[PDB]
Design a protein around this ligand. Sequence first.
Ligand SMILES: Nc1ncnc2c1ncn2[C@@H]1O[C@H](COP(=O)(O)OP(=O)(O)OP(=O)(O)O)[C@@H](O)[C@H]1O
Ligand SMILES: Nc1ncnc2c1ncn2[C@@H]1O[C@H](COP(=O)(O)OP(=O)(O)OP(=O)(O)O)[C@@H](O)[C@H]1O
Ligand SMILES: Nc1ncnc2c1ncn2[C@@H]1O[C@H](COP(=O)(O)OP(=O)(O)OP(=O)(O)O)[C@@H](O)[C@H]1O
Ligand SMILES: Nc1ncnc2c1ncn2[C@@H]1O[C@H](COP(=O)(O)OP(=O)(O)OP(=O)(O)O)[C@@H](O)[C@H]1O
Lengths: 319, 319, 319, 319, 319, 319
Amino acid sequence: LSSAILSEKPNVKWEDVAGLEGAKEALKEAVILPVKFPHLFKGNRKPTSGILLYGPPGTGKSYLAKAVATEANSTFFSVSSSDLVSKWMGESEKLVKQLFAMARENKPSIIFIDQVDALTGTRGEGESEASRRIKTELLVQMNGVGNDSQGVLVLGATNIPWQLDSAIRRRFERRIYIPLPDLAARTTMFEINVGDTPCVLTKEDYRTLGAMTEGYSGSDIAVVVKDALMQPIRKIQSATHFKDVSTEDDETRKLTPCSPGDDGAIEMSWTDIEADELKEPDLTIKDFLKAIKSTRPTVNEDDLLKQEQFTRDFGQEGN
Amino acid sequence: LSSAILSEKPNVKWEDVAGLEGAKEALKEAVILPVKFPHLFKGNRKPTSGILLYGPPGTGKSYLAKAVATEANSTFFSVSSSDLVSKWMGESEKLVKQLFAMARENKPSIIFIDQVDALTGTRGEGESEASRRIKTELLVQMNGVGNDSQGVLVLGATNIPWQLDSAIRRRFERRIYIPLPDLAARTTMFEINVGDTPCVLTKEDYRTLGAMTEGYSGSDIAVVVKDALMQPIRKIQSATHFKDVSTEDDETRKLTPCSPGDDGAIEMSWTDIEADELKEPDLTIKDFLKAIKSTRPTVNEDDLLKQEQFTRDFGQEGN
Amino acid sequence: LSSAILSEKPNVKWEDVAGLEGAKEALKEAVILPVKFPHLFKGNRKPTSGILLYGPPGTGKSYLAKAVATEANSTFFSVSSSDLVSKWMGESEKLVKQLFAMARENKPSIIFIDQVDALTGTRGEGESEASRRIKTELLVQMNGVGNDSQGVLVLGATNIPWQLDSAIRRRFERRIYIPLPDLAARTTMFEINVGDTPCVLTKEDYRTLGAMTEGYSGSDIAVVVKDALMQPIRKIQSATHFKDVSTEDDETRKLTPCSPGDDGAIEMSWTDIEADELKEPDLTIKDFLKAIKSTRPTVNEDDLLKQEQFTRDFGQEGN
Amino acid sequence: LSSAILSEKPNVKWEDVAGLEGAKEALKEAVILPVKFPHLFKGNRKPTSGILLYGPPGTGKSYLAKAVATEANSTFFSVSSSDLVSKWMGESEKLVKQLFAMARENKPSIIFIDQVDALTGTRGEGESEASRRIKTELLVQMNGVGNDSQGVLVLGATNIPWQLDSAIRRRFERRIYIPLPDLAARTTMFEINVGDTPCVLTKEDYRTLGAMTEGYSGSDIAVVVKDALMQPIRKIQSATHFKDVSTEDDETRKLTPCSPGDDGAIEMSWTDIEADELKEPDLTIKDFLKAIKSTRPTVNEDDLLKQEQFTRDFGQEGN
Amino acid sequence: LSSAILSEKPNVKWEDVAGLEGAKEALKEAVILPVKFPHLFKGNRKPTSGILLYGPPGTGKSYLAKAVATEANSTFFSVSSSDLVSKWMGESEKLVKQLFAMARENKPSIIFIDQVDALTGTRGEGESEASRRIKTELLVQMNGVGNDSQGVLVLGATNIPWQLDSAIRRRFERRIYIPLPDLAARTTMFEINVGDTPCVLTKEDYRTLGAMTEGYSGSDIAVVVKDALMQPIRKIQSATHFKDVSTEDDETRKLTPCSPGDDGAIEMSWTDIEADELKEPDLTIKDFLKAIKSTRPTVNEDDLLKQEQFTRDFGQEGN
Amino acid sequence: LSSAILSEKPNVKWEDVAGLEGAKEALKEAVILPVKFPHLFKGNRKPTSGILLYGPPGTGKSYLAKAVATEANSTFFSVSSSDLVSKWMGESEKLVKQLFAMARENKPSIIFIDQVDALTGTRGEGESEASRRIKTELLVQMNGVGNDSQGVLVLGATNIPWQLDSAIRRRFERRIYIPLPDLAARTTMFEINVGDTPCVLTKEDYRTLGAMTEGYSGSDIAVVVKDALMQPIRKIQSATHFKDVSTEDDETRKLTPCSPGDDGAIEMSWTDIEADELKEPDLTIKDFLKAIKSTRPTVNEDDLLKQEQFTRDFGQEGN
Ligand SMILES: Nc1ncnc2c1ncn2[C@@H]1O[C@H](COP(=O)(O)OP(=O)(O)OP(=O)(O)O)[C@@H](O)[C@H]1O
Ligand SMILES: Nc1ncnc2c1ncn2[C@@H]1O[C@H](COP(=O)(O)OP(=O)(O)OP(=O)(O)O)[C@@H](O)[C@H]1O
Ligand SMILES: Nc1ncnc2c1ncn2[C@@H]1O[C@H](COP(=O)(O)OP(=O)(O)OP(=O)(O)O)[C@@H](O)[C@H]1O
Ligand SMILES: Nc1ncnc2c1ncn2[C@@H]1O[C@H](COP(=O)(O)OP(=O)(O)OP(=O)(O)O)[C@@H](O)[C@H]1O
């Protein structure tokens, strides 16, 4: 009957969300400011009902949705455009009706439709057959809630905003463009995870490597991080001949990963090695070089020409 | 069985609608006049059954309909593309038979069908099984009732008209085009959307606005209005200083933003001091100027070509 | 089982309807004639079953079916895909069976199926789930009435002829093409639809209007009539001053709309005038001229392009 | 539980059924021969298990089944696929098992399933799942096998052998393609339906009728004949003058319409002229000419594509 | 509580079943050879839980099963494919328990299931009622036969293999492919179906039968045989002329159809020939010239390709 | 999921895996090591989520997956991709997610997806909707959660590790090649195949057989063993006379196959052979030469080489 999707409590703060200040401003203004001071928004003015995030994949749109949901002080409705039901003799609209309707009585609430471009058909697709009932139903019901309930937030996280129909995006309110990460943002994104190996060289090297690794997405950064995690393990693959860097005064000889060519190295059962005698090497520049060697820029120039054209004619902020 | 949807009275005035006088009087002739003056309705005179609205979306079709909700002085039921269940396979038609049944036995009532383009068929293949019979039902319910005796009114509000079926088109009586509001109309939209704010110190400002802003609907204009309301709040959010120029007749001193180069002013922030002792400045021009610069027009010119093509097919007045 | 249709009685005469007396002759010959002269239909000469009406929308094929229904003297029942439909995801063949049988009980019977394309396809991919079963039943029932001897007359009215199936087409009688109204017919339809209103009766005016009104169905002409009827009401809503045109034979001084600077110009509003003294203005010539200035032509060619391909080498029968 | 379906049979000969002689001959082989000479089918040989007819619509395959039923001198069962169908939902195929049980319990019976395409064919749907069990039970009951078993001739008709299931085609025994008739067969078709009226009794006329036009089934020819018969009657409808062509030997003047320039011409209402005194006009070539000019030949080449793809490469007797 | 399924004893044996040497093999060691093993049944040899027969239609799976049932001398009850279903929508698996339990109670047992794909998929709909627990019940009963001594054997037979459910197959062992008979096998089948037919005993002519024919099964070959047998019937029916060939050694005057150009040929009709005096002529190559041209195969290559991907994918280990 | 998925606590051990050095390297660092020492990883290093097992068919990838699942005593859930593509028209996302939920509820489980390749296919048509969304869904679920709860392990299996996730193309994670067994391994598998039963020839003969087979699989060997079990069978069938074994040891006469004339060849026929007197002899070279004869080459040729090409290219880590 209901089939309601649960909303967990993820821990992503504003300090974790690196870069893009204007979006943060828009979101605080959108949700946090009316929660902080409600009597200001009265009479004529009403809060932003339909905020649109857009950009290429892996850039932290879902991550920002989760971030807002962390510091919401409110309910949430996580849902994908495709993943609930899709074409079974029609009827994928009742789900929407129960979604919005059950968001009405529970005031201050945040809806999130992941990838709205999947609903609309660019050539024909389901939009010719039965998905017109979806596109219509969303189009009508999104405005009917803000007419009745007054200020129920719907957050757009589309990848393809220009194939998307013009009728949806004019009913949907202000836009938020997501460009590629900049100096400070990429920099801080390196020092979030791990932190057991006590840093690397000074922050100038994070900027040098940063400018070398500029143009990467958030997922690309995550993959770099994962690579760096796996680096000492692939250094363990090459070893099987363990040297002790420290002295013999400790409880056990600290086994470092290294080749047999280096002196003072001996072999043993690598499977049955305890954690205390293990020791990771320092994270070298070759981590970033292996990252580079994975064929990086998914964000190519010719594809995002359209992104930046559909950007500039509306711009920062928007509808 | 019954499936009641609307039983409310949202307050909308006569003067809220701006563009086209003849478009309003078309409805007024068609809706209120026969109920008000039934003695005139005798013999050869027949009621204007069916009032379709069309045009580029955002301009004010749904808004017009929901104005009519206040202006009707009678019970009515809206409906989207939400004919319920085909899991049973049979009840989809019977719901329409109930819908048309619940309209006619109750004396003068209305039915609002949002987005008639969804309920459309012509190519067939996939339509034949499920929705072809729905379209046929739609056709057959407004076939015999159209002439002689009729206590029902049909309404329509589509995004794009030309994809609709020919049979529904020609058989439906009164279609109306809703263009982009002119300088006087949009000015009137500005004037009404001022509301409870303490005035604006100019009359030519509206002219400046509506002349500069070209190719805007009611929606995005109201969005701009919302923005320009939330501008001085942002000014307050950035600004710290306050020179005491508050009246003694009020309950207490009220915080308003002032310039840094101005002596005798406390610099305690909006966050520290209470919100009940806060004040917003009067609306300027520059807030609207920058609001225009942020919010560029949503309605593209390429979409209007086929709109006007449909107009020169059928036009402002129905048929 | 007992859920039957109600037989209403709209007084539609033969001489009132215009457009093709050959069709009328086919109808009378099929329906009324054998009731009239039953001895003339005894032997090889027989009344064939299944006269198909079709054409563009709003041309009056449904209305012509009602014209048969009026003067047939027939205990008839008509139904589209409303009552006769599957309910339990299965059986709607019995409904056809007892439908035909309950028509076979009283044998001055006509069965009118409005929009036969609803209960028809061609292959349908997964048509065996439902529609093939009912369609097949329909096919198998009227085999015995198509030729040989049975006293039932089937009728049909559809806008899309090519989507109708071959095997149904060869089960059916003569398919009478109903085109758009022509000069003389159209000319007739003006004064008949207007009724007994004072409409300055001269045939030259009808000649002129009929000349000017090119490319119009029958329904749109009734809409035009309706517009012309609504016109003097509109003048009543734009009537500032009134004057007594008629003499003092009636009980009160009868007031009718006039020019502002006229003799005896009473200033009270149109709503304040009582029904006994409220007299509508007489119908002019230019009211129609302006009506057709507002009322643009109805007939789009795109639908008729296939009918141009049809009517030449198809038209009468399949072919 | 028991519900038998048996009906009376009027006169239908072998001679009047025009078409392929081998098809009729094959039916003689399958029907009359085993009853006449049963000792021939005792040992190696067995009677024909089943013959499925197929072709374009209105070709007389149902009429052929009728003819066989007349000339069988046996218990002729005839029932469609969707007639015997589950009302209860639980029980379903037991109706079929009782039916073929009835076929077994009576000595050599003949079964007829009109439109076999209703069931049989499916593309992984299973006709709403539940009715796949009928599809399945039809095979396991041992009807279509070409080995051993009781002599029970199952018959059928279909317009779509490509939609028909391959496994059943392979299972069920013999096919007969029913083609469209040629000069000779068509000529016969003309010369049968005559009756009391002696039109123009020569072979030149019928061979002109057959030679001029082309592309006919059997039902359309019948329709044409009917039209031709009705021609003089509709000419009696438009009868101004009257003439006594009949001799004085009769009881009263058997009147008929005539040309204006005639000796002893009289004018009155044609309705008052009774059956005994109404001499009908004799039929002519021009009557058939006008018949043709109204009633077109009814064959379409789009149906012949998928038919001939099933036939032309193979020839006769099936796929 | 009547559970008396039709026990029968056909006259088919291993000698008159041509082709499928591997299948004949695999059934010999699955049943009859295990009947001769009441000592080395379990231990070395793993007994078969179930045998799946699959392939194109008309290959002879049912025929094979029946032959087996004749041969083995076992308590056999071939299941009704569809009828194991809830009549009252309550009891259902009681019938399964009646089947399997009584099949266990006499342990020279065989259970044959023609069309195991009757339990077709799921798709929701009406499968969730008693059919779900039928599906489960099959699985519990085949877990029942898995335990204890394997007297019962699940002989799976189906036309469409891929539509059968996964979970049945995953708990199922033996899968014997049944292809179309090759040249030798087809020749031997012809030889079998000849039997007691006059003459035609030359191996070059049986080559000739085998050579021209391509891609056939047992059903269509039987049909061909039947046709061949019916040729001399037609040659009797056509030939009016006759002559006595038999001498005084034969007692009865054996009448037989002579050549047309024959001196002193009596011309009494074929219908006047009595049973005692009849003599039908011997078969020739002329019969097979007409048979091969007339009769033709059904199933396409693509079905066999589906069987080849089923062959390559499924069959091995536990698929 | 309604018995489509297998579940058990398997007890499959390292000792039964003959020489799979690759598994023994990769799994022991990826899975076993984290099980042993969870705290052994510095920073945010967390266990592998997905492992692809890839190689030719019949290497017991299932056996290996079960052995992996044996180590934590983890529940082994497993499902076939092929099986849920065509039957349902797989929109199984909701059920996959529920599956994951239920498996997550049970503390560490392992998910096994067999033939992951069957999901891929950039073909087009209606297959797109039943493939593309599954592929998208697969690529989301492979990193559906950010470590934390996907310590629960996904094992993919493929025989054709080209085309999409297994291939050069994109994504996955750590992959392992599962090679065919070498001579020694195959010999050990022969040693482990079934439970012998009375006496065979030498382990070196089996090495000879294993030497004779290059590129043949564990499954091919299992086919040879299934053929081995039929050696006594085919002895029973093919010999006409047998020879006595019972000297002074056995109580009753017991036979082995020989030629008709031999020293101690009993003379009654194979058909006569009673239960007790039947005795399978030892399996000799001649029985295995006959096994060599009756096992044709199994294996596809070009895939081996392509997978060697991918092995040379990739294998280490994700792509
Ligand atoms: N501004 C940011 N600050 C820190 N981390 C980020 C930022 N943007 C992206 N990331 C990282 O990228 C990872 C994945 O990004 P995410 O999947 O949210 O992108 P997405 O565009 O929403 O993808 P999809 O549209 O497919 O859901 C996150 O785990 C997060 O750590
Ligand atoms: N030939 C005519 N004579 C008189 N009135 C007509 C004629 N044609 C149309 N009308 C008027 O216009 C209306 C036509 O409506 P109607 O529903 O019959 O059109 P239709 O084409 O049959 O509809 P559909 O396409 O649904 O079958 C009628 O109410 C009738 O009064
Ligand atoms: N060869 C023929 N001889 C005599 N009458 C014929 C012949 N062919 C057609 N007819 C006449 O025309 C009609 C044909 O209708 P019938 O249903 O028998 O054809 P059909 O091919 O079975 O149609 P369908 O395939 O649509 O069921 C019959 O009523 C019959 O009187
Ligand atoms: N090897 C054979 N020898 C003799 N006759 C055969 C052979 N194979 C098939 N036939 C004949 O063809 C017919 C095949 O019918 P059968 O029902 O056994 O095929 P099937 O594939 O099981 O069909 P279904 O699956 O629809 O039951 C049998 O009646 C039999 O006479």
